[PDB]
Design a protein around this ligand. Structure first.
Ligand SMILES: [Mg+2]
Ligand SMILES: [Zn+2]
Lengths: 652, 1319
DNA sequence: CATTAGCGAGAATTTTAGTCACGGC
RNA sequence: GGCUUUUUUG
DNA sequence: GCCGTGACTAAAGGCAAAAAAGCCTTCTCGCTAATG
């Protein structure tokens, strides 16, 4: 390749070939004149070395290097290794019709659509614009259309909007950890120079809005378009292949808003009335005459599919809160009312959402999820939940507790002064003492924070769940855990040395108050170790992933039935105390290797070669079966494939 | 008391700890290092002198000719820093040395000088420190990080049995020289000692032991203890001491003098030892069978026969006893051999030694060093001698010698540069002691075993290597001796040394590309320590132990400031008060405490000594007399912190700040944040971007003035005085009569750079921040630099923030921004880009740059001049043309605008080679540059002859000429006025004699500037001329920027929102930034909440000052109010009385406070909540700091009051347009026919293999096939689809991946036959 | 006017698995 | 346009 | 005398992106250009 100027850039292969041909010609000319045999030995040996290096460098020994003082690339070098031809140009190759941008959240977008900058749309679909323009007769020649598109004419944006009505696009984030890393969408034109993305899928991508770069590709053929529309839409991906747990679980503020909805108070403005229906409740709240959450009785209607695929309604009165009545708007017909009458934490709602998918199918549940989106965001915005410096209520007793702590240690060290104890005994004593003090302080600060006093309707103090903001962030499960709450107001706890030992003196201070110099220094050991572990784990783990790909990349389902009865007995796991996992889940979604036998002799509870699901599992729960032998892939007989029944029910 | 520069705005601070030792010069580590490199050192122990003394003098092989060094000096630089930056030349100075040539007669006694010749000889160009302390190589600025490496010396490491199944602990000893070959000693699982050299094959240790002319007997004597046996009547007796009775079982009864002392059969007892030492018995009979396991210590031969009965290192038996008894060997010498105390490891190695004559040992060593070579005995001797005794091919340096002596408990700390036999013997003894439990192993991570290697040592080593090369060359030359034919300049070649130095400074693992996008990053990059580079670990070879923080890191390296990613724990920055020791070890300040009194005495303590004393805590309560107010205090002794009495304490930390680096120090309220988010915040603050207009942060650390002054980005008042003339580019300072020089004092001139390109396309601007006619003093701040205000660091802005969810626009981590922010342009920045065009001389006619361009419309030329250069100030757009460069075919290869970028042209620079005609545009730019230079020069003249003609008029007044005539007569006419008065004439005539000299030197310096400007610029070979264009672009905030806080709470802008829709309070003042509170508890970095609350406190005073200023109320009531604000606090060290301040000063301070009172905070002496609440009480804000709000969308009142305040918000160096790009169809790689990669090349994304598996996981097949074949490399097929898309048919074609064929040929390029099959 | 570079073109650390030599009863 | 070397984002 | 044993050696260690820099052997001489 010629660079600027008279110089020509040289490659390693050319230099090695030149060396080899020079030596070959030298030996040829020298041999034609019958030179002394001593010379030809050295020339032959050096030609052997040269051809060796050309075919492979550094393998035998000292490697030929150039002006860079580095080993020149060989033929084996070009084909082996990460920089080799395979892993950089056969299993992966840069492609056209692609773009890179930065993710930005968009609330108003529906589930099955994503944003897109105008510049990206124009650049990506320029090939599509030319054909449509000639079809509409705006321009005749390709060059004229090319001139038109760069001019940003009025018709250009209109035709672009016309041609990208339902043309699917593919979105992925490097690194693409799991198969959910690639999803299709129907783009919609927006302003700016950044891509707008639906919120829930961010949890699936494990992508936070911290500046992550996002990639766009575009399918071309009709087959590719229909393929993406039928498979890669978000609507068709709600249950992860990893497990049946839904992957569209709301997180953070949506959970916070929903929790703020369904939470009663002892007394509030506009409490104790009776309302015709949930529709009236919205009228009261917007007018502000009644508080968002107050215990009242409202007539509600629920539909049940208990009949043979038929919906039946009923009407009664319930003792619920206004907010729950508001939330009842978006609930579809099938779901019973009892599932939206609790505190509605993060665990419940997802589970609740799961229940919908168990009954109403797919379109009702995606519409339900979008409605949860909109309502939760609106009411969280109205909620005005904020964190303040006075929110971290410091426990009063904790202080003096630390005082009394010194007491016992003031004695324990004396035991070492008198020699009645060893270093290990004193170490274990102080470790246990500090652990007990930490537990006591944690319990006390839980007790002081989680509850509050408030006057009832009759003028007496009543105990209800406290409305301190941190408690709404914690108990709702939206973000954080009890460990974080302990770290905020309570004392930090024992701290670990780099090797693994524990410093005798724990961090008695908390983050709300100040920290002395040494304790902050001590805490850095664990933080630095965790950061290093996170930094170096992604290299080792991902490589492991690759080793799993090649071992099992030959497995494709080929035939429906293997026609064998061999299987593996399946029993719930037990360690001698509580069962780690019940027998229910681990046998779910499989088939019976042999028919289920009742404890009553000669009774067939379940026929052989039958799929298992919830309608059958409860029968096992009713009968309380100890174990069952089920079909597995390890026993299917068909070669070059896997029996369809052997793998059983597919997670997706 | 305060100087005038800070009287403009006094910033209140909290804190109760008085300061004892202020922050020193932040760059003292770097500059003062390189300083020690260039001056003339009479001691000859530093820099060039020390390097020369190690190479000079040199002698010939014949010994008749010699070369000596005399003296050296550094020539003056050709240009200054600005000219070198502009012209792209290395700011360097020539090296001048004086050499001595000596000749000795071959027919005369040694020392008889034949002839002498002294001559200055050119050595080359050495780069020099900038006043800021950087390097200039090719118009660019580079800095040298300080390498941290393993200290030369000896270490004893244990593998903890990791490599062995049984887990038996192995101890290995490593000696590492400063330069030379390494050396290792190990224990095998079989419990034997082995030696290895240069990480080579394991070899038995004793091979080298006898290699030093040691017999077996001497080795055994050195390594063991002697036991003596005496032959009595058919008996053997041994001289027993109680001390040697450790870990022994009494096989036979121990008795002497007929009395039984120790029982028979069982183990020894302590009481038996006590009774034996009480009896004091030495000699005791021993049974013969008890000696069945004893190895004879020495050799035994028979005098009569003359044959060897039994040599050393063989087990004895009863028959050997018979021979030694019959030969008269009554005394028998054996080894003590107590496995539990002195294991016989050496003897086992002796039992496996291949030879003993030391000649076959040298042969084996020779074969070991180089396999397959003739075992020449003298060659082996020479190799050993120059491998372990060479003065030059091996060296330990002074520091290595001191460490070696200290480790082996030696007293003297001075020694030679080579090793010794006693040294290796003592190393073996200590290794044996470690194996036996005596002593203890050392730690690699301890700072006492590591040192910092600054730029001075790097330069010294590289220069020494070059000098070694050149002296070998000149030795080879002088080997061909001559009868003084040559002059002592020809035999030397400056090319090797010059090339080595320049390449090391230019391209090296440590010569990183410095990034001065803002002063804080520049400072933290200058003070960075790296463990990479030569003689250090790599990015991958590093383990889990080096990355970890060590308990001795306290006060020396910041534990929380370091880059995160593939390299963690290796690029840790130096701490604040840290300085280097003379040997090269890190040391920290401490205060000596005597009799429970903390005086002001300051000591510097290294790492090792820190383990021998007791160290207190910085935030330890103290009285006014240095007494700890309570007897029980927290202190640390050795990696552990425990309670101690007030009398055991010896040293206390000087201040709280000495634990973090500057980057962490600038973080306010750090003491309430996690280490992780603190690190993230410091790292992000390092990546800040200059603001269009700097604004002081409301909450600060207190060292902002120090960091601003120390960094060389803001002009500082070199001398005190008053301002005379002011300009947006130039500053004129008239010095006072106190600081004026005795001769030619005059005044001082400062030039301010305007919009100069940085190293990351950021705008570097200098801002004059002083008024006319105001006094200045030494060390003040005169010109605000980028992101600087009144000598205070100011990176970002202060926004009205409110923690509240808002319709999900800040769903996960994003930030909502009101359009009011972009209305005021408070975040719009300036970016400067470079476009360069090169005109070389190729074939088909040289590259010609002219406005003549074929097949182009008049629109392209409309922005071009006749000379082919764009006019200054044109509004160029993307896709246009800047310079017209053509080559005859005519081929149009002219430079064009990069795609997708617009801007405005600012400056054009043209470089022309010497001897080449300069075109009209070059002549124009040259003439304006010369006019500017001469105007500046003539200005300095005008001032200087103003002074001297004022002196002339004063002289003529006294002489006799009336003062009125001097005023009336022409100014220049004063010189020619009659000199009739002799007494004054003696100086009146001299006045002209100096005026003529001054004008002549001005003329010659002006001509020098003119010829420098007209000088043809040096270029790369084959390059005729080049042209350079500056583009400048304004960037405004658009959705997608990377905008963050100071506590690691990063985020991305979501969507610009009209201000009417933002939340607002009862007063109607909107809030412009809406964060997401949910990120607080998870990040648990509660500090930012306190920061916001303190922010409210600042402006709680700010508005009130604006109130009186609007009402123009009386000064008196204002004066006390500001007085009341400062006095707030508990036992605050800082106190200010405004009574001394004048009314004008008070008014100026008040009006400068209109934007709010700044508040400082020490990192660990920060303010608590009580004073925050009290200060908020001084304002009219609620104590809880949670005011209600109203939504513009709804107009109602939120049920729960929320927190609002000002917070210091930063914009990072990540713009959407720098990352937003896409490719439809463009170029292709010539090799694989695949699309390229990179925005600059207009390439597309990379189809990651990870997502190839991910796509394959689904049922998706057609899309994968399309991605693989059509859009990647099928040049034969992708063309059809491109045509097919035009017709509207979205039909594909399978084809065959072109890149796959390539591989085939590659495999076909070997002796491997591969081919496809039939259908 | 007189002397000489010169370069253009040509040429001369961690971890694991596997294999191989010695040796032990 | 290939390689090398740094720096940075996730 | 064959299996055990230890000693020696080959091979890999994340994904994507950006931003910079700097190179592509070295020795030798005749007419043109650099130099005095
Ligand atoms: Mg992220
Ligand atoms: Zn099967």
């Amino acid at each position: 390749v010629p660079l600027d100027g008279g110089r020509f850039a040289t490659s390693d292969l050319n230099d090695l070939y030149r060396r080899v041909i020079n030596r070959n010609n030298r030996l040829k000319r020298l041999l034609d004149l019958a030179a002394p045999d001593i010379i030809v030995r050295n020339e032959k040996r050096m030609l052997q070395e040269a051809v060796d290096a050309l075919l492979d460098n550094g393998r035998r020994g000292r490697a030929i290097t150039g002006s860079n003082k580095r080993p020149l690339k060989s033929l084996a070098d070009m084909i082996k290794g990460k920089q080799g031809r395979f892993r950089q140009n056969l299993l992966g190759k840069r492609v056209d019709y692609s773009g890179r941008s930065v993710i930005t959240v968009g609330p108003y977008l529906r589930l099955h659509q994503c944003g897109l900058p105008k510049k990206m749309a124009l650049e990506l679909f320029k090939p599509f614009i030319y054909g449509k323009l000639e079809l509409r007769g705006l321009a005749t020649t390709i060059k004229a259309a090319k001139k038109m598109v760069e001019r940003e004419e009025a018709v250009v944006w209109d035709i672009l909007d016309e041609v990208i009505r339902e043309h699917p696009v593919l979105l992925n984030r490097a690194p693409t950890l799991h198969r959910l890393g690639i999803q299709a969408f129907e783009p919609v034109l927006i302003e700016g120079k950044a891509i707008q993305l639906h919120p829930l899928v961010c949890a699936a991508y494990n992508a936070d809005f911290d500046g992550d770069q996002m990639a766009v590709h575009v399918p071309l053929t009709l087959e590719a378009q229909l393929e993406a529309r039928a498979l890669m839409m978000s609507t068709n991906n709600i249950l992860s292949p990893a497990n049946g747990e839904p992957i569209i679980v709301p997180s953070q503020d949506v959970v916070l808003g929903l929790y703020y909805m369904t939470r009663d108070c002892v007394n509030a403005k506009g409490e104790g009335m009776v309302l015709t229906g949930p529709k009236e409740a919205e009228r009261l709240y917007r007018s502000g005459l009644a508080s968002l959450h107050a215990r009242v009785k409202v007539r509600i209607t629920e539909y049940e599919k208990d009949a043979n695929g038929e919906l039946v309604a009923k009407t009664s009165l319930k003792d619920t809160t206004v907010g729950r009545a508001i939330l009842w708007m978006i609930v579809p017909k099938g779901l019973p009312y009892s599932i939206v009458n609790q505190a509605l934490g993060k665990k419940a709602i997802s589970k609740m959402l799961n229940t919908c998918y168990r009954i109403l199918g797919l379109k009702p549940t995606v519409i339900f999820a979008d409605q949860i989106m909109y309502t939760g965001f609106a009411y969280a915005a109205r909620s005005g939940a904020s964190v303040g410096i006075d929110d971290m209520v410091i426990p009063e007793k904790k202080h003096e507790i630390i005082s009394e702590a010194e007491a016992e240690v003031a004695e324990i060290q004396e035991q070492f002064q008198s020699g009645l104890v060893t270093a290990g005994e004193r170490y274990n004593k102080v470790i246990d003492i500090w652990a007990a003090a930490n537990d006591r302080v944690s319990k006390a600060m839980m007790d002081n924070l989680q509850t509050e006093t408030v006057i009832n309707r009759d003028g007496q103090e009543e105990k209800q769940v406290s409305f301190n903001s941190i408690y709404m962030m914690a108990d709702s499960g939206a973000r954080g855990s009890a460990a974080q709450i302990r770290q905020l107001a309570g004392m930090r706890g024992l701290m670990a040395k780099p090797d693994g030992s524990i410093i005798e003196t724990p961090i008695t201070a908390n983050f709300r108050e100040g920290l002395n110099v040494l304790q902050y220094f001590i805490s850095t050991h664990g933080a630095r170790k965790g950061l290093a572990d996170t930094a170096l784990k992604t290299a080792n783990s991902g490589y492991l992933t690759r080793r799993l790909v090649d071992v099992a990349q030959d497995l494709v389902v080929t035939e429906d039935d293997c026609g064998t009865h061999e299987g593996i007995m399946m029993t719930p796991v037990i360690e001698g105390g509580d069962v780690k996992e019940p027998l229910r889940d681990r046998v779910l979604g499989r088939v019976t290797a042999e028919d289920v036998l009742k404890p009553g002799t000669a009774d067939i509870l379940v026929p052989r070669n039958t799929l298992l699901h919830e309608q059958w599992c409860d029968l096992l729960e009713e009968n309380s079966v100890d174990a069952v032998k089920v079909r597995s892939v390890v026993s299917c007989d068909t070669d070059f494939g896997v029996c369809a029944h052997c793998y059983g029910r597919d997670l997706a | 008391v305060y100087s005038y520069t800070e009287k403009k705005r006094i910033r209140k601070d909290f804190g109760k700890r008085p300061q004892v030792l202020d922050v020193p010069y932040l760059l003292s580590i770097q500059l003062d290092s390189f300083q020690k490199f260039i001056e003339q050192d009479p001691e000859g122990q530093y820099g060039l002198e020390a390097a020369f003394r190690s190479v000079f003098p040199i002698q010939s092989y014949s010994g008749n000719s010699e070369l000596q060094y005399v003296s050296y000096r550094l020539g003056e630089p050709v240009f200054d820093v600005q000219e070198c930056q502009i012209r792209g030349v290395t700011y360097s100075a020539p090296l001048r040395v004086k050499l001595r040539l000596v000749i000795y007669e071959r027919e005369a006694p040694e020392g008889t000088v034949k002839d002498i010749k002294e001559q200055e000889v050119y050595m080359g160009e050495i780069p020099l420190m900038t006043d800021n302390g950087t390097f200039v190589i090719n118009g660019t600025e580079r800095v040298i990080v300080s390498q941290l490496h393993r200290s030369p010396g000896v270490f004893f490491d244990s593998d903890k049995g990791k490599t062995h199944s049984s887990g038996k602990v192995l101890y290995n000893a490593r000696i590492i020289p400063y330069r030379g070959s390494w050396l290792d000693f190990e224990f095998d699982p079989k419990d034997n000692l082995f030696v290895r050299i240069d990480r080579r094959r394991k070899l038995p240790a004793t091979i080298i032991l006898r290699a030093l002319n040691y017999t077996t007997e001497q080795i055994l004597d050195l390594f063991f203890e002697k036991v003596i046996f005496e032959i009595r009547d058919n008996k053997l007796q041994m001289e027993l001491v109680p001390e040697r009775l450790r870990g022994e079982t009494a096989s036979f009864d121990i008795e002497a003098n007929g009395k039984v002392y120790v029982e028979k059969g069982r183990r020894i007892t302590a009481r038996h030892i006590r009774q034996l030492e009480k009896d004091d018995v030495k000699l005791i009979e021993v049974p013969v069978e008890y000696i069945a396991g004893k190895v004879v210590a020495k050799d035994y031969i028979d005098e009569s026969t003359g044959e060897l009965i039994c040599a050393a290192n063989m087990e004895l038996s009863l028959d050997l006893l018979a021979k030694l008894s019959q030969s008269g060997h009554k005394r028998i010498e054996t080894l003590f051999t107590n496995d539990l105390d002195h294991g016989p490891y050496i003897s086992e190695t002796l039992r496996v030694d291949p030879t003993n004559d030391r000649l076959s040992a040298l042969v084996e060593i020779y074969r070991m060093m180089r396999p397959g070579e003739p075992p020449t005995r003298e060659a082996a001797e020479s190799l050993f001698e120059n491998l372990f005794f060479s003065e030059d091919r091996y060296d330990l340096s002074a520091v290595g010698r001191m460490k070696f002596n200290r480790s082996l408990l030696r007293e003297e700390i001075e020694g030679s540069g080579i090793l010794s036999k006693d040294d290796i013997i003592d190393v073996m003894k200590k290794l044996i002691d470690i194996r036996n439990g005596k002593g203890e192993v050392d730690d690699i991570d301890h700072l006492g075993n590591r040192r910092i290697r600054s730029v001075g040592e790097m330069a010294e080593n590289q220069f020494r290597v070059g000098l070694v090369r050149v002296e070998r060359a000149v030795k080879e030359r002088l080997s061909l001796g001559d009868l003084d034919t040559l002059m002592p300049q020809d035999m030397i070649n400056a090319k090797p040394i010059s090339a080595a130095v320049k390449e090391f400074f230019g391209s090296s693992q440590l010569s990183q590309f410095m990034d001065q996008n803002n002063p804080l990053s520049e400072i933290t990059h200058k003070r960075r320590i790296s463990a990479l580079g030569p003689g250090g670990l790599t990015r991958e070879r590093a383990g889990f132990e080096v990355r970890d923080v060590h308990p001795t890191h306290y006060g020396r390296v910041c534990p929380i400031e370091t880059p995160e990613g593939p390299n963690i724990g290796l690029i840790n920055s130096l701490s604040v008060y840290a300085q280097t020791n003379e040997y090269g070890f890190l040391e920290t300040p401490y205060r000596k405490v005597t009799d429970g009194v903390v005086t002001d005495e300051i000591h510097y303590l290294s790492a090792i000594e820190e383990g021998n004393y007791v160290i207190a805590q910085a935030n330890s309560n103290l009285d006014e007399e240095g007494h700890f107010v309570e007897d029980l205090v927290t202190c640390r002794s050795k990696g552990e912190s425990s309670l101690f009495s007030r009398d055991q304490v010896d040293y206390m930390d000087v201040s709280t700040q000495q634990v973090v680096s500057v980057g962490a120090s600038l973080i306010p309220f750090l003491e309430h944040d996690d280490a992780n988010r603190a690190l993230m915040g410091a790292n992000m603050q390092r990546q800040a971007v200059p603001t269009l207009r700097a604004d002081k942060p409301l909450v600060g650390t207190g060292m902002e003035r120090a960091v601003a002054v120390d960094s060389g980005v803001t002009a500082v008042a070199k001398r005190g005085g008053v301002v005379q003339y002011v300009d947006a580019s130039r500053i004129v300072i008239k010095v006072n009569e106190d600081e004026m020089y005795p001769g030619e004092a005059g005044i001082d001139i400062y030039n301010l750079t305007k919009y100069t390109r940085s190293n990351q396309n950021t705008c570097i601007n200098q801002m004059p921040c002083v008024s006319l006619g105001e006094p200045v003093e030494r060390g003040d701040v005169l010109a605000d630099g980028p992101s600087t205000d009144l000598g205070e660091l100011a990176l970002g802005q202060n926004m009205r923030v409110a923690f509240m969810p808002w319709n999900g626009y800040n769903f996960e981590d994003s930030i909502l921004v009101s359009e009011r922010v972009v209305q005021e342009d408070r975040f719009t920045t300036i970016h400067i880009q470079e476009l360069a065009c090169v005109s070389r001389d190729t074939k088909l006619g040289p590259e010609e740059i002219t406005a003549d361009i074929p097949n182009v419309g008049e629109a392209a030329l409309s922005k071009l001049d006749e000379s082919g250069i764009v006019y200054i100030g044109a509004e160029v757009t993307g896709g246009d043309i800047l310079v017209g460069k053509v080559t005859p075919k005519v081929k149009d290869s002219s430079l064009r605008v990069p795609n997708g970028v617009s801007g405005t042209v600012i400056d054009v620079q043209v470089f022309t080679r010497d001897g080449v005609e300069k075109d009209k545009r070059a002549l124009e730019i040259e003439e304006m540059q010369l006019k500017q230079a001469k105007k500046d020069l003539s200005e300095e003249l005008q001032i200087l002859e103003a002074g001297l003609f004022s002196r002339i008029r004063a002289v003529l007044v006294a002489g006799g000429v009336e003062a009125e005539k001097l005023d009336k007569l022409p100014r220049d006419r004063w010189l020619e006025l009659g000199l009739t008065d002799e007494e004054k004439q003696n100086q009146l005539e001299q006045l002209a004699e100096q005026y003529d000299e001054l004008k002549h030197e001005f003329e010659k310096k002006l001509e020098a500037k003119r010829r420098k400007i007209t000088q043809g610029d040096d270029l790369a070979p084959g390059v005729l001329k080049i042209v350079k264009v500056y583009l400048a672009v304004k960037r405004r905030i658009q959705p997608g920027d990377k905008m963050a806080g100071r506590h690691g709470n990063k985020g991305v802008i979501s969507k610009i929102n009209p201000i009417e829709d933002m939340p607002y309070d009862e007063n109607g003042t909107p809030v412009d930034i809406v964060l997401n509170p949910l990120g607080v508890p998870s990040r648990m970095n509660i500090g930012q909440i306190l920061e916001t609350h303190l922010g409210m406190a600042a402006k709680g005073i700010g508005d009130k000052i604006n109130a009186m200023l609007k009402q123009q109320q009386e000064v008196a009531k204002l004066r006390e109010f500001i007085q009341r604000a400062y006095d707030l606090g508990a036992d605050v060290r800082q106190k200010v009385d405004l009574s001394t301040f004048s009314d004008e000063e008070v008014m100026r301070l008040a009006e400068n406070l209109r934007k709010g009172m700044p508040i400082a905070t020490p990192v660990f002496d920060g303010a608590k909540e009580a004073e925050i609440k009290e200060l908020l009480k001084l304002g009219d804000l609620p104590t809880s700091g949670q005011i209600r709000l109203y939504d513009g969308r709804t107009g109602e009142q939120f049920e729960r009051p929320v927190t609002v305040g000002y917070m210091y918000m930063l914009k990072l160096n990540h713009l959407v347009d720098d990352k937003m790009h896409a490719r439809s169809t463009g170029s292709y790689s010539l090799v694989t026919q695949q699309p390229l990669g990179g925005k600059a090349q207009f390439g597309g994304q990379r189809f990651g293999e990870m997502e190839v598996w991910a796509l394959e996981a689904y049922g998706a097949a057609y899309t994968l096939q399309e991605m693989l074949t059509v859009k990647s490399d099928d040049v034969n097929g992708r063309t059809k689809m491109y045509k097919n898309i035009v017709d509207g048919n979205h039909q594909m074609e399978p084809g065959m991946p072109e890149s796959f064929n390539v591989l085939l040929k590659e495999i076909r390029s070997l002796g491997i036959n591969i081919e496809l099959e039939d259908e």
